[PDB]
Design a protein around this ligand. Structure first.
Ligand SMILES: [Ca+2]
Ligand SMILES: [Ca+2]
Ligand SMILES: [Ca+2]
Ligand SMILES: [Ca+2]
Ligand SMILES: [Mn+2]
Ligand SMILES: [Mn+2]
Ligand SMILES: [Mn+2]
Ligand SMILES: [Mn+2]
Lengths: 237, 237, 237, 237
């Protein structure tokens, strides 16, 4: 029922629903079967960094995941989001575990949206940046198992007392304010987001990954979207 | 019941409750009887501009109202907002009419909040800027008579069909997201806001003006705060 | 001798050197014969607005020119600027007249450059914004006939006393500070610029237009690059 | 000959020229004998963080030095910089050693200047942020012993091969572009800067500290301003 555009960091290859048989980043447009992907050397235990970028002039959504000192995977997909998203949306992060599991820690998150026309480069803008999460974060909507305060961190999926990931968990966090991503007079709309994540898995076969998603404002976790559906899509079509 | 800190643009001198007998800007801390004011040459029909500024190192809240080509009135008040506001607040604009009346148009509005510690100048930030208001502004909470879309403008108080101000009107608009204005580890918290307003009055004796206010997150118009109480305070104590 | 990447607003079609036989925007990479163009309805006398955007993940340089209420022309070109520009450059505007002429007024200009790695979305940044030009603008390098102060405006090419454009004129303006546009560790470098221009021509056959260009830091006007060479390139190859 | 406004981090108490007999931060206006100071618990070996802030409405210059987990010293001084600085200035950092010595490492630096009038909150702005210094930093003017590239760090004063501070050293670094700090129409001018520093001293009696200074654009090290004069002032009057 929801419209979802997402960039997925996928740590487990469900080949039966279109996954490359490796860890990959991907671009999803309304479906979990990514429109485009790229091989990703998931570095268990290391803190990574994901940048998403988009602007309506170029009409190309791009993403990069990089680890401190070395690797970057990267992926882009030309798409015009005017005819996909609604002009008001909410922005968030999502992650799930299933049979196998991993921590899905978000250590920081920032987003910037601009609607520019001409009028001497005049704008509408939203910007937020958490470089630390409070135990009482009144400006995040937490959904599912998502919790905060865990060392100043956003724990998207459930973790037991000692610091071990639990299975079939699904959490999401959305910024509280609606976002006006597109508008018909805007000669250039654009956005870009970054978050630093730490994925850790003991059972060295992690699952399921994390996603940054833009949705219709009233989105909530579809029934039975733990594991391979990333808490985003209600089926795998 | 609400905690309010506000900067008031007061167009009508209610001397019986502590007003200088002229148009003034003022700084209110929990009371409508301003802690500090300054004479203001209200320029009926002209578009003005107000800048509010604060930072917890200097502990001095300041405001300026200026009209295109010429006048600025200005006012500051040393106050430590740690021991006044709650650490989560909502930010908004407010305006009312009473026996006499004026249009209370807001043409644009922007706000920026930062919580900085050290860690190589690292931050938490919120920022929004409307340079035009939509007819369906999903990120403003409108209270009272406040409406949008009126030529891309925020009409804080009621105006009849032809463009004439109505009496005893009270509207408010608050940004949708809670704001974390203060936090105990922040070595410097700070904020600053600007809005451009157009006040017009036919009955050349305008009232009551406009205010930018920070409140507890769940604030709403106190009963019978039209006219001299600016839709902010429930009594005049 | 110079390396130039530029986006040209071309008001006069020199078909003999590869121009579409109409007003066009274009993307130049080291040559005046654009790599890509788009038809442009030059609106003599109206103030227009140009946005340039680039980021090294998508590797696509895009531009839009829009006039207040209505038209936008737009153009993009996938190019990897790592292997074109030097990692330190200067940024500027350029414009020329020749046999025919036009005013080449810049009313405002802003630019933003970021070099991001990971390290929790940490950056290097430069940003400037002139919304008005001083008569003594110590942070612009003016070259050729370029002058400031003309009503708070940057007059790229020569204009006589009464406000009439002169022929075979060439001016350029560059921001004073070198800019570090690219660096080998940056997992995402990006920039974007906007300027509002007012072109006016009495002899209703205007020439030669305006360009935003990135060059090696020590660039200066090539000999005899008035008219169709926009003060950018020394020949038309 | 130079006009200097500076905030000094002073690690060595020269009581004979007006120092409190302890490590202090201070505000200097044209003289090394600070207008105002505050006790500072210099934490040898730890990375500290300094925030300077100013805006022309409040007319109060403030500074904070804080160390990770714990201490902050703080100091403010009401001063109107319109009648002190020239409207074009350069901004920089400075540090010196003398008989005793310390490393004077700058690990990052950022600055933001705005000239706002009304016109719906419209601006002129400069902003730069180095979160790492290059070996070939084309946008810094280095003066005296100041060098870069030293682990991605700005080494304001001379350090020998193994990492030991040398005596009677004086370095300065200024951002390349002139800065327009004040202008007569600005209804609010404002600036703010941050840098992270690491001071280390083996001879546990460190000297002389570091300063952030605004000067006339053509400033250079006064003769014999090593040690207690911080490379800023030519005498101690
Ligand atoms: Ca999967
Ligand atoms: Ca009143
Ligand atoms: Ca041409
Ligand atoms: Ca001293
Ligand atoms: Mn996948
Ligand atoms: Mn009052
Ligand atoms: Mn051309
Ligand atoms: Mn001192």
């Amino acid at each position: 029922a929801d419209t979802i555009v997402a960039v997925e960091l996928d740590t487990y290859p469900n080949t039966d629903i279109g996954d490359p048989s490796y860890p990959h980043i991907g671009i999803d447009i309304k479906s979990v079967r990514s429109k485009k992907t790229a091989k990703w050397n998931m570095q268990n235990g290391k803190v990574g960094t994901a940048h998403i970028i988009y602007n309506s002039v170029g009409k190309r959504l791009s993403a990069v995941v990089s680890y401190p000192n070395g690797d970057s995977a990267t992926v882009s997909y030309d798409v015009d989001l005017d005819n996909v998203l609604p002009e008001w949306v909410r922005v968030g992060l999502s992650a799930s575990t299933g049979l196998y599991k991993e921590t899905n820690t978000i250590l920081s998150w920032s987003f910037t949206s601009k609607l520019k026309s001409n009028s001497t480069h005049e704008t509408n803008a939203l910007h937020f940046m958490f470089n630390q999460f409070s135990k009482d974060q009144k400006d995040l909507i937490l959904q599912g198992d998502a919790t905060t305060g865990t060392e100043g961190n956003l724990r998207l999926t459930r973790v037991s007392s000692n610091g071990s990931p639990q299975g079939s968990s699904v959490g999401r966090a959305l910024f509280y304010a609606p976002v006006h991503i597109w508008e018909s007079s805007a000669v250039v709309a654009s956005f870009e987001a970054t978050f630093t994540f730490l994925i850790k898995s003991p059972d060295s076969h992690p699952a399921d990954g994390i996603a940054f998603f833009i949705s219709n404002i009233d989105s909530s976790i579809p029934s039975g979207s733990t594991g391979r559906l990333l808490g985003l899509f209600p089926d795998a079509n």
